[PDB]
Chain A
Amino acid sequence: QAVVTQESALTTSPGETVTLTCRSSTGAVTTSNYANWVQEKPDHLFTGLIGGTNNRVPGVPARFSGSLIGDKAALTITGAQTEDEAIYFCALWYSNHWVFGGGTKLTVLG
């Protein structure tokens, strides 16, 4: 029944640091929500980036990190490349189901 809200789109330059927000409707995102950040490349290529709000999938480049800022989950990309232009989704674990965010259309100028 909860709704996960994200920004519509984010715009950065290569080499910069960007922060992406995951907000939960019911309240503050905790460590029991197990925030997943996944990435959709163009033409429906999906990749799982960060799980458990901290743990990073092996093979994911080290510039991706996940954390909790304030009352919301957050994805920080430090030194974003031009290949990181994608759509990022956040999934929050409630008592018995996963709820996905709207998806931020992260674009990198080139």
Chain B
Amino acid sequence: SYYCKKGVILPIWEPQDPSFGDKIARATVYFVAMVYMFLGVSIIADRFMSSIEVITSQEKEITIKKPNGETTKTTVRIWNETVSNLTLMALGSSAPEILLSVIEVCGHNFTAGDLGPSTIVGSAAFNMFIIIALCVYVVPDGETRKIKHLRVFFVTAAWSIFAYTWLYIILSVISPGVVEVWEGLLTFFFFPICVVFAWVADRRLLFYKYVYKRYRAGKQRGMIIEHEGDRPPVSKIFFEQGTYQCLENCGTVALTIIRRGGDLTNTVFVDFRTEDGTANAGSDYEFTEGTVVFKPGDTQKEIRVGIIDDDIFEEDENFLVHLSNVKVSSTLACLGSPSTATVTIFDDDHAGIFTFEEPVTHVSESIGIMEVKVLRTSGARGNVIVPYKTIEGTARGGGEDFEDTCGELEFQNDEIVKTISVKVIDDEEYEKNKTFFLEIGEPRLVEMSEKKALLLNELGGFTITGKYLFGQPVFRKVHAREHPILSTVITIAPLTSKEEEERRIAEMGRPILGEHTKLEVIIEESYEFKSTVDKLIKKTNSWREQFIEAITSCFDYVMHFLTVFWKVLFAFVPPTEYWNGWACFIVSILMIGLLTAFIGDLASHFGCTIGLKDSVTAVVFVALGTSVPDTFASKVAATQDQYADASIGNVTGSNAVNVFLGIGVAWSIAAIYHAANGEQFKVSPGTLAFSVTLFTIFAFINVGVLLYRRRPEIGGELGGPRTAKLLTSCLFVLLWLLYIFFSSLEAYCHI
């Protein structure tokens, strides 16, 4: 239509519908004015996000020790990059959309207009496609950005899409064409669910306190962002060798008999038999007899002697294999040398020698969870309990410098290493040298066979375990902390002086401690934080400073002379150091509220001057104009970070808070005001329904492409191969162009 309703601030240009060239002049003036207000909104929203960054950051005082007497003192601010902080920054960059929706609803006598909801759905489309494509492209070539936390991405993206799905539901499914008080109230109340989820994900889903910390220089004067990172000649018959060697767990040992010399075209018979030496038949090896036959043309025959495995430690033992009774069927063959083989069995049932890798280790305070390996050396037989504890040294740690931990490591059978996790508290110190200790106690063999329990003379209580080892049931010792049935437990409980020696060798194989039983852990300062502080101190009354920075290379001159009026006007905003950033917070959110009051007029009167509908001019112009802070915040988080969690998370949180507060608050106020008068609040669903369903269909395609770029050929969400990078960016921009063009046609009833 060509008739313009009066705005909140701007009056109607008169007369209406003057001519054709006058429409061109009026639309040109409104368009230039609206672009200039978009530049003003971008600058003031950048300052508003800087104030929010100031509020949610902890202030630290940095002492810089120097070799000379004078030591400089600095004050810095650390901003944690958490989900609860990123959703507040996304709320800060979503202030123009939220304020435009609320101001247009309240200013025009609580009547639903196309402008607010339409620029919010267009903001969803622009954020979801154009900003994500640009963040895909900006990442440097050869570098990849991957979402480490994929569950959080799934939940947040599903919630952000469900926001616009529920916008469809309240307008078309439940009482179509009418927004009730409960519908708008629940739409508003979904936002605290988002905030509580951000807090819970920070506490439990991420374990942010215990991730590796990286620090980067901020955009403000003293701000430092701390984020998650990756934590760094007749024939004769004789033995081939004459002495064979085997382990105890080999099962069988191979002995090679050779017939050599004489004539091969004959049959030879020779007997073999084992004899006990230090090792006894039936306990250490299988007693075997036999006769081997040498065929004509045959020279060597392999015989196999069984070795009995067990659980008891023993010394190196030996037994003898003899050959005898050389015969020839149908002298020609004799018993050669060596006629006797000595087979030696090495035991491997030592329960272990437990030690630390090094006596002293150096860790940074940003390590988060530190892992100390405890090694098991020279045997890994049985399950053993090794107590461990932390000892306070210079690092007085009860949550101050570290978290006290103590307990027991259980090494299973044939397990040769275990880890101890110690929680290191990060304090952001420029210079730190603290010391604590980690000690391990006497190991105890808690799980063994029954015969080993006889040989070790264990007098405790054993509960039979379902496991079977070397063909024997496995028994486990009962601890005092455990309360069993007391019918389940079994007490296993003049020696011939040979069995006494067997017990002594059995006790020689019990678990003991190694070289390093105490670890001295030295907590030191972060190199990344120290280098970032050095970068700050290399390059770093404030009321005067803002005005001096306001007015100060041809492209820089063009941008400076374009934005000098806005910078001079916004230099009257209080600096962020006042009121812990709240002084800048109160004024800027006022100023944004002013500049989205004019835009809501300028976007409206531009539409009716040339006959453009409010929905189309909100989708293509207002949505692109109010998402610029989201564009730069997502680009910075895509470039400077190591993961893609923050860049996509800003888009997703912005899409959620655009609905839950931008539409929720405005339609709650309108529904309550109309319900006070006993009348319904009527919203036309036809314009918004096609836009929100088109957004859902394109958003599922976007999420599918984002998940498909996780393959190792591409490697991650952002960046990656250049040829796939270009295709992904062009695909997403094409999705945005198709969305805005289809919605533009559909607004004019073309369907």
A contacts, CB < 8 Å to B:
32, 95-96
Asked whether any CB of chain A lies closer than 8 Å to the CB of B534, the reply is no
> B512 contacts which chain A residues (CB < 8 A)?
95-96
* B107-127 at interface with A (beta carbon < 8 Å): none
3 intermolecular pairs with C-beta atoms under 8 Å apart: A32-B515, A95-B512, A96-B512
> B515 contacts which chain A residues (CB < 8 A)?
32
Closest 3 A/B residue pairs (Cβ): A32-B515, A95-B512, A96-B512
Which residue of chain A lies nearest to B515 when distances are taken between CB atoms in the complex? A32
0/1 interface trace, chain B 500-525, chain A, CB 8 Å (1 if under):
00000000000010010000000000
With A and B bound together, what is the CA distance between A95 and B515 in angstroms? 11
Quote the shortest CB–CB distance from B438 to chain A (angstroms): 14
Quote the shortest CB–CB distance from A35 to chain B (angstroms): 14
Quote the shortest CB–CB distance from A51 to chain B (angstroms): 12
Quote the shortest CB–CB distance from B202 to chain A (angstroms): 40
With A and B bound together, what is the CA distance between A96 and B512 in angstroms? 8
Quote the shortest CB–CB distance from A68 to chain B (angstroms): 15
A-B contact count (CB 8 A): 3
Which residue of chain B lies nearest to A96 when distances are taken between CB atoms in the complex? B512
With A and B bound together, what is the CA distance between A56 and B575 in angstroms? 56
Which residue of chain A lies nearest to B391 when distances are taken between CB atoms in the complex? A55
How many of B's residues come within 8 Å of A, CB to CB?
2
Quote the shortest CB–CB distance from A3 to chain B (angstroms): 22
Quote the shortest CB–CB distance from A30 to chain B (angstroms): 10
Which residue of chain A lies nearest to B518 when distances are taken between CB atoms in the complex? A52
Quote the shortest CB–CB distance from B642 to chain A (angstroms): 42
Quote the shortest CB–CB distance from A11 to chain B (angstroms): 36
B contacts, CB < 8 Å to A:
512, 515
Which residue of chain B lies nearest to A95 when distances are taken between CB atoms in the complex? B512
Which residue of chain A lies nearest to B437 when distances are taken between CB atoms in the complex? A55
Quote the shortest CB–CB distance from A28 to chain B (angstroms): 16
With A and B bound together, what is the CA distance between A96 and B442 in angstroms? 11
Quote the shortest CB–CB distance from B377 to chain A (angstroms): 15
> A95 contacts which chain B residues (CB < 8 A)?
512
With A and B bound together, what is the CA distance between A32 and B516 in angstroms? 8
With A and B bound together, what is the CA distance between A95 and B514 in angstroms? 10
With A and B bound together, what is the CA distance between A32 and B512 in angstroms? 12
Quote the shortest CB–CB distance from A56 to chain B (angstroms): 13
With A and B bound together, what is the CA distance between A95 and B507 in angstroms? 12
> A32 contacts which chain B residues (CB < 8 A)?
515
Which residue of chain A lies nearest to B510 when distances are taken between CB atoms in the complex? A96
With A and B bound together, what is the CA distance between A95 and B513 in angstroms? 9
> A96 contacts which chain B residues (CB < 8 A)?
512
Which residue of chain A lies nearest to B508 when distances are taken between CB atoms in the complex? A96
Quote the shortest CB–CB distance from B444 to chain A (angstroms): 14
Quote the shortest CB–CB distance from A8 to chain B (angstroms): 33
With A and B bound together, what is the CA distance between A5 and B512 in angstroms? 26
With A and B bound together, what is the CA distance between A96 and B505 in angstroms? 13
Quote the shortest CB–CB distance from A58 to chain B (angstroms): 12
Which residue of chain B lies nearest to A93 when distances are taken between CB atoms in the complex? B513
Which residue of chain A lies nearest to B514 when distances are taken between CB atoms in the complex? A32
Quote the shortest CB–CB distance from A94 to chain B (angstroms): 11
Quote the shortest CB–CB distance from A44 to chain B (angstroms): 28
With A and B bound together, what is the CA distance between A32 and B515 in angstroms? 7
Which residue of chain A lies nearest to B513 when distances are taken between CB atoms in the complex? A32
Which residue of chain A lies nearest to B439 when distances are taken between CB atoms in the complex? A52
Quote the shortest CB–CB distance from A52 to chain B (angstroms): 8
With A and B bound together, what is the CA distance between A32 and B514 in angstroms? 9
Quote the shortest CB–CB distance from A33 to chain B (angstroms): 12
With A and B bound together, what is the CA distance between A94 and B385 in angstroms? 22
With A and B bound together, what is the CA distance between A95 and B512 in angstroms? 8
With A and B bound together, what is the CA distance between A96 and B515 in angstroms? 14
Quote the shortest CB–CB distance from A75 to chain B (angstroms): 20
Quote the shortest CB–CB distance from A22 to chain B (angstroms): 20
Quote the shortest CB–CB distance from B413 to chain A (angstroms): 23
Quote the shortest CB–CB distance from A34 to chain B (angstroms): 9
Which residue of chain B lies nearest to A55 when distances are taken between CB atoms in the complex? B391
With A and B bound together, what is the CA distance between A96 and B353 in angstroms? 13
With A and B bound together, what is the CA distance between A68 and B515 in angstroms? 18
Quote the shortest CB–CB distance from A97 to chain B (angstroms): 12
With A and B bound together, what is the CA distance between A96 and B443 in angstroms? 13
Quote the shortest CB–CB distance from B439 to chain A (angstroms): 9
Quote the shortest CB–CB distance from A105 to chain B (angstroms): 32
Quote the shortest CB–CB distance from A23 to chain B (angstroms): 23
With A and B bound together, what is the CA distance between A32 and B356 in angstroms? 14
Quote the shortest CB–CB distance from A6 to chain B (angstroms): 26
Quote the shortest CB–CB distance from B35 to chain A (angstroms): 74
Quote the shortest CB–CB distance from A95 to chain B (angstroms): 7
With A and B bound together, what is the CA distance between A47 and B296 in angstroms? 83
Which residue of chain A lies nearest to B359 when distances are taken between CB atoms in the complex? A31
With A and B bound together, what is the CA distance between A38 and B512 in angstroms? 24
Quote the shortest CB–CB distance from A43 to chain B (angstroms): 32
Quote the shortest CB–CB distance from B394 to chain A (angstroms): 15
With A and B bound together, what is the CA distance between A32 and B513 in angstroms? 10
With A and B bound together, what is the CA distance between A32 and B355 in angstroms? 12
With A and B bound together, what is the CA distance between A96 and B504 in angstroms? 12
Quote the shortest CB–CB distance from B11 to chain A (angstroms): 84
Which residue of chain B lies nearest to A32 when distances are taken between CB atoms in the complex? B515
With A and B bound together, what is the CA distance between A32 and B359 in angstroms? 12
With A and B bound together, what is the CA distance between A32 and B517 in angstroms? 9
Quote the shortest CB–CB distance from A85 to chain B (angstroms): 32
Quote the shortest CB–CB distance from A66 to chain B (angstroms): 15
Quote the shortest CB–CB distance from B388 to chain A (angstroms): 16
Quote the shortest CB–CB distance from A98 to chain B (angstroms): 13
With A and B bound together, what is the CA distance between A95 and B511 in angstroms? 11
Quote the shortest CB–CB distance from B393 to chain A (angstroms): 11
